[PDB]
Amino acid sequence: ATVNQLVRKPRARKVAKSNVPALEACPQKRGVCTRVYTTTPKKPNSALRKVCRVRLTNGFEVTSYIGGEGHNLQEHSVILIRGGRVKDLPGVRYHTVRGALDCSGVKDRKQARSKYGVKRP
Amino acid sequence: ARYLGPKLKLSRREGTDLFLKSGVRAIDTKCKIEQAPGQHGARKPRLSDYGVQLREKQKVRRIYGVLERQFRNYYKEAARLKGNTGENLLALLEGRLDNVVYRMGFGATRAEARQLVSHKAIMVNGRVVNIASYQVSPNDVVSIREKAKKQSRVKAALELAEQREKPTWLEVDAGKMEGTFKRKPERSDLSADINEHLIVELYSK
Amino acid sequence: ELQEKLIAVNRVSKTVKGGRIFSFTALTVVGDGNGRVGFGYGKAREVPAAIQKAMEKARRNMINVALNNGTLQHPVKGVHTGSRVFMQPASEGTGIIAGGAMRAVLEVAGVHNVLAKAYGSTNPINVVRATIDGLENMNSPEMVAAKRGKSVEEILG
Amino acid sequence: MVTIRLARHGAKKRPFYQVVVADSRNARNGRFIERVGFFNPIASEKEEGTRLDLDRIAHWVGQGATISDRVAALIKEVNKAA
Amino acid sequence: KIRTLQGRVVSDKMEKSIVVAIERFVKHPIYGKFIKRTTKLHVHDENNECGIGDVVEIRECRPLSKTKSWTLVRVVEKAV
Amino acid sequence: SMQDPIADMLTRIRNGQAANKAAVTMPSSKLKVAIANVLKEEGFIEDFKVEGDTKPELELTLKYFQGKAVVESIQRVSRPGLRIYKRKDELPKVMAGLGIAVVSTSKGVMTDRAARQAGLGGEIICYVA
RNA sequence: CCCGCAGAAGAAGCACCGGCUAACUCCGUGCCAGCAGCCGCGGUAAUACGGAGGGUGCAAGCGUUAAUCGGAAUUACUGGGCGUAAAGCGCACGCAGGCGGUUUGUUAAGUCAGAUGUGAAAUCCCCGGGCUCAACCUGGGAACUGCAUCUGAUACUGGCAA
RNA sequence: UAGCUAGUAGGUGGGGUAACGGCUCACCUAGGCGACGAUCCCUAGCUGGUCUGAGAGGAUGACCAGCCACACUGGAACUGA
Ligand SMILES: [Mg+2]
Ligand SMILES: [Mg+2]
Ligand SMILES: [Mg+2]
Numbered sequence A: 001a002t003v004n005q006l007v008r009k010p011r012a013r014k015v016a017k018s019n020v021p022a023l024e025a026c027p028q029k030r031g032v033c034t035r036v037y038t039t040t041p042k043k044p045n046s047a048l049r050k051v052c053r054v055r056l057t058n059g060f061e062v063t064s065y066i067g068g069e070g071h072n073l074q075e076h077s078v079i080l081i082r083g084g085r086v087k088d089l090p091g092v093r094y095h096t097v098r099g100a101l102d103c104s105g106v107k108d109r110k111q112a113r114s115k116y117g118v119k120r121p
Numbered sequence B: 001a002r003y004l005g006p007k008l009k010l011s012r013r014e015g016t017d018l019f020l021k022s023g024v025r026a027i028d029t030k031c032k033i034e035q036a037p038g039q040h041g042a043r044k045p046r047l048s049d050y051g052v053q054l055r056e057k058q059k060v061r062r063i064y065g066v067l068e069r070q071f072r073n074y075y076k077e078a079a080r081l082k083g084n085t086g087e088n089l090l091a092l093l094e095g096r097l098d099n100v101v102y103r104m105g106f107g108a109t110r111a112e113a114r115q116l117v118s119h120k121a122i123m124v125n126g127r128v129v130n131i132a133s134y135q136v137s138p139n140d141v142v143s144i145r146e147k148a149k150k151q152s153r154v155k156a157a158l159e160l161a162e163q164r165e166k167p168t169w170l171e172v173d174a175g176k177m178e179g180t181f182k183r184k185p186e187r188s189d190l191s192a193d194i195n196e197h198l199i200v201e202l203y204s205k
Numbered sequence C: 001e002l003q004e005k006l007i008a009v010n011r012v013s014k015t016v017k018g019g020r021i022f023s024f025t026a027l028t029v030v031g032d033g034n035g036r037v038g039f040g041y042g043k044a045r046e047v048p049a050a051i052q053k054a055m056e057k058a059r060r061n062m063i064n065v066a067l068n069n070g071t072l073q074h075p076v077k078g079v080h081t082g083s084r085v086f087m088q089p090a091s092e093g094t095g096i097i098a099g100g101a102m103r104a105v106l107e108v109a110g111v112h113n114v115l116a117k118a119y120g121s122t123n124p125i126n127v128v129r130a131t132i133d134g135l136e137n138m139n140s141p142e143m144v145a146a147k148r149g150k151s152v153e154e155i156l157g
Numbered sequence D: 001m002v003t004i005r006l007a008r009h010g011a012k013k014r015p016f017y018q019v020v021v022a023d024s025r026n027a028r029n030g031r032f033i034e035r036v037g038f039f040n041p042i043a044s045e046k047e048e049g050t051r052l053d054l055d056r057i058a059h060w061v062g063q064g065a066t067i068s069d070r071v072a073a074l075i076k077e078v079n080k081a082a
Numbered sequence E: 001k002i003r004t005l006q007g008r009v010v011s012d013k014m015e016k017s018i019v020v021a022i023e024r025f026v027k028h029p030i031y032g033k034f035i036k037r038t039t040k041l042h043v044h045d046e047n048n049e050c051g052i053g054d055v056v057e058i059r060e061c062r063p064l065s066k067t068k069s070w071t072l073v074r075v076v077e078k079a080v
Numbered sequence F: 001s002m003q004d005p006i007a008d009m010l011t012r013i014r015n016g017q018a019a020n021k022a023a024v025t026m027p028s029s030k031l032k033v034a035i036a037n038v039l040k041e042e043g044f045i046e047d048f049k050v051e052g053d054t055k056p057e058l059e060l061t062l063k064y065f066q067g068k069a070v071v072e073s074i075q076r077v078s079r080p081g082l083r084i085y086k087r088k089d090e091l092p093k094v095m096a097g098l099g100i101a102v103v104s105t106s107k108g109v110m111t112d113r114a115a116r117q118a119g120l121g122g123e124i125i126c127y128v129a
Numbered sequence G: 001c002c003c004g005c006a007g008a009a010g011a012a013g014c015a016c017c018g019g020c021u022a023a024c025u026c027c028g029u030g031c032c033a034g035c036a037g038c039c040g041c042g043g044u045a046a047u048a049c050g051g052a053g054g055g056u057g058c059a060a061g062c063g064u065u066a067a068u069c070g071g072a073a074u075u076a077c078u079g080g081g082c083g084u085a086a087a088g089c090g091c092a093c094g095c096a097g098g099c100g101g102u103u104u105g106u107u108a109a110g111u112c113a114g115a116u117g118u119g120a121a122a123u124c125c126c127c128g129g130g131c132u133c134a135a136c137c138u139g140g141g142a143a144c145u146g147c148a149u150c151u152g153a154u155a156c157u158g159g160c161a162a
Numbered sequence H: 001u002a003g004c005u006a007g008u009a010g011g012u013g014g015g016g017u018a019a020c021g022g023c024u025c026a027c028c029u030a031g032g033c034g035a036c037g038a039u040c041c042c043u044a045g046c047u048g049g050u051c052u053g054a055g056a057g058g059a060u061g062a063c064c065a066g067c068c069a070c071a072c073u074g075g076a077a078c079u080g081a
């Protein structure tokens, strides 16, 4: 406040950072993948949540949650990664896309199959 | 483009008669009207402020046979134009060719009038027109060509127009199946039931 | 000429030696549709008992409001507690574009077309007192002409 | 070289030529000093079709500017007294 | 008439040359407040006529060094 | 140290009306009389004087129609820290034309209504609701 | 573009359905498997998980992801604050800087008022014209909130004055 | 990122440029820029506009159009208005 004070030092706009460093306004990004493993989540949930240490094409190393019941990933395997935090596992801020490249679709999913990359019967 | 499904189901959801399954028969009373939208029709809706606005828009859509992408563009046109935004919406919906052909009597239902327009039967100012969404300006002369004139899906449907209200703004000859769109449609003439106020709200946010 | 409606219903706790005992807090508004508005809070053990209790307070607590045809005279702030609030007269076209709770108190009053935004907090109880703070404070040229000992045409024209 | 010529605007298969005074080096729809009406070859016997401001042509041609093959025909079309 | 931007002298230690700080009281685009802003120039003069701390009229002219594309018309209200 | 006297004049009016008081004395000036003569001629203040020859003192006599005060609200606009000047068309109409903005124009201080008919603009001194 | 020819003939998905937000039950599983934009659902009667029927909204598109503004008066000039929520330097003196009591001059810098040329064309907004209609195209006008100079007004701001 | 700058800043004279000018040599003079941000560092073609917003702004500058810059990297001149 105080108008002369703002002439001498203008309003510094609050630069809200992007949650996902997949970078360059990218929709998705490839990853060669390492260490497909499992982790127990925060307090109120309790389960064994699937996850893989993805090694992105642009140099970064991330953890991606693998959705659905059952998956194809093991150690390596080239996978497409989208954005989307889980709000359960602390730090896992990406989602492994199913159908795309080597992560195939989940078996027998009739309802909701754009997510999870499954075709018609 | 169109609904192409169970038509009389849509009348039960809203409740009021949408003139979908009208035809040669006058009144339905053959569907358990009002109290059976789906399976759980014994249930009664609480209905919020978003609901009442949405159900009004959904009703006015299904009466005229318009989809939301096309409907949203009709709203934007009404916002540009002068006067009351609510009365302009209904003026543009009534100005469609398939709707004017239905009001003339050349088509027992609105889906019949829509297909009758589409199949090169309807002529207007000497020009053949295939578009339902053709915006009919005032002082026109819609008519049927001699190929489709006096066939067995028009003379039967034209007898229903005797029973109908018959709007003031248009005239029909009913001799050589000729029509004359005289002036634009006013609010006070038609409707007298469906609400314009609630639809203007929904899109303003 | 009744015209009455519910804005919100909020459930509140007491907490006693035993456990905790819930009571519902309604909030109704009433108005003739011609410059008479009243809100009534009301609170009871049951929900339908609360709104019927709430409607009795609102009927007795009416406030007179002057207005031009079917809209406000001039733009008006109406601060109360947290909700600062704002509303502008607008033209014969358009409809009542305002927030929930803030629109209820408008539409039942008599106004048919205004702009309005609820700055600060937007608590259903305070925004109703905010609008009615503004609408009670608002004044017509017939008031102001007599107030300044002059004339209605000379001030306006 | 300043030249009075057609610019070619409009949609695919439905052209609309903005007759315009520009330098020859400059592109078809490039810079110009100012326009001088328009041409449309798909009007038919109706109200409007072609325009050409005769006063501005007397300014530019009187100073020094060429008239292209099509615009030469439009000055013949409007006529002097016919 | 011809151009004549007024301005106050800052220094003269240059030989047939001067530095003038023109004053202009333009407002801020955003905030609306009228700020006391400077337009600092150099100006030509036949001999070191003007000294320091005085108002001066200045004309836009031919370039006559690198920078210094302004000519002194005359002095108004000379130094104390 | 009393930087703006015009703001201070308007506070004595504002805090005068809240207090329910008839007489409100203060130091006078050229501009204080020019503002006061607009407010009397329109109708917020029933009469005023500028007694004291050598060392002037301006006292106002404030208006109350009901028990409620006549001056609803009164605000300095073109304050000395941030001056405001407006064009012919851009002169603000307070309370949609039942409330006045005192404006210092080239042809003396006057109301915003008078500045339209005069055909000019200037420094908007203060709003008066 | 027009005419005829044959004949229901060739031509519908995919999200979601606990609240925010329009839309419900039944089986399967039992803090497991899984969902999710926030709150959160699952511990043997799940409207939130998986399937099933029904429904809702979109429909030749629909969702998901990313990206920008918006809502955010959550960088606030219009339009926020600073006793206790984040926020008064530990307290003075003071240079540049900002701001300045009051009266009479002049003054044309701010200021305002007008005038002139410029503010490329498209784009935008208003009314027309043309593709069967619309996108799309296009005619005219306003608009181009400005900018520079010129001539005034001289209350308020500033200079030099008394 | 707090001091930078030696043809650096200005003169007189000669040369050079289509043209003025440290454009460039020759003295002469020790100034010029800087808290109304020089220097240094990072990032970036700019504008008409576009998107968004009630507006003030905020973001942006694909496509259509004006200007600049570049043509395997670094450099140079020649021929020509
Ligand atoms: Mg479509
Ligand atoms: Mg609550
Ligand atoms: Mg509660």
Ligand SMILES: [Mg+2]
Pocket (backbone or CB within 6 Å): D028, D029
């Ligand atoms: Mg081209």
Ligand SMILES: [Mg+2]
Pocket (backbone or CB within 6 Å): D003, D066, D068
């Ligand atoms: Mg040629």
Ligand SMILES: [Mg+2]
Pocket (backbone or CB within 6 Å): none
């Ligand atoms: Mg200016």
Ligand SMILES: [Mg+2]
Pocket (backbone or CB within 6 Å): E065, E066, E067, H021
């Ligand atoms: Mg130079």
Ligand SMILES: [Mg+2]
Pocket (backbone or CB within 6 Å): G035
């Ligand atoms: Mg789901």
Ligand SMILES: [Mg+2]
Pocket (backbone or CB within 6 Å): G045
């Ligand atoms: Mg079960």
Ligand SMILES: [Mg+2]
Pocket (backbone or CB within 6 Å): none
């Ligand atoms: Mg589900």
Ligand SMILES: [Mg+2]
Pocket (backbone or CB within 6 Å): G072
């Ligand atoms: Mg904001």
Ligand SMILES: [Mg+2]
Pocket (backbone or CB within 6 Å): G080, G081
């Ligand atoms: Mg705050």
Ligand SMILES: [Mg+2]
Pocket (backbone or CB within 6 Å): G081
């Ligand atoms: Mg506060």
Ligand SMILES: [Mg+2]
Pocket (backbone or CB within 6 Å): none
């Ligand atoms: Mg504390």
Ligand SMILES: [Mg+2]
Pocket (backbone or CB within 6 Å): none
């Ligand atoms: Mg604290």
Ligand SMILES: [Mg+2]
Pocket (backbone or CB within 6 Å): none
């Ligand atoms: Mg302290």
Ligand SMILES: [Mg+2]
Pocket (backbone or CB within 6 Å): G089
């Ligand atoms: Mg400090």
Ligand SMILES: [Mg+2]
Pocket (backbone or CB within 6 Å): G091, G092
């Ligand atoms: Mg201190």
Ligand SMILES: [Mg+2]
Pocket (backbone or CB within 6 Å): none
């Ligand atoms: Mg001190």
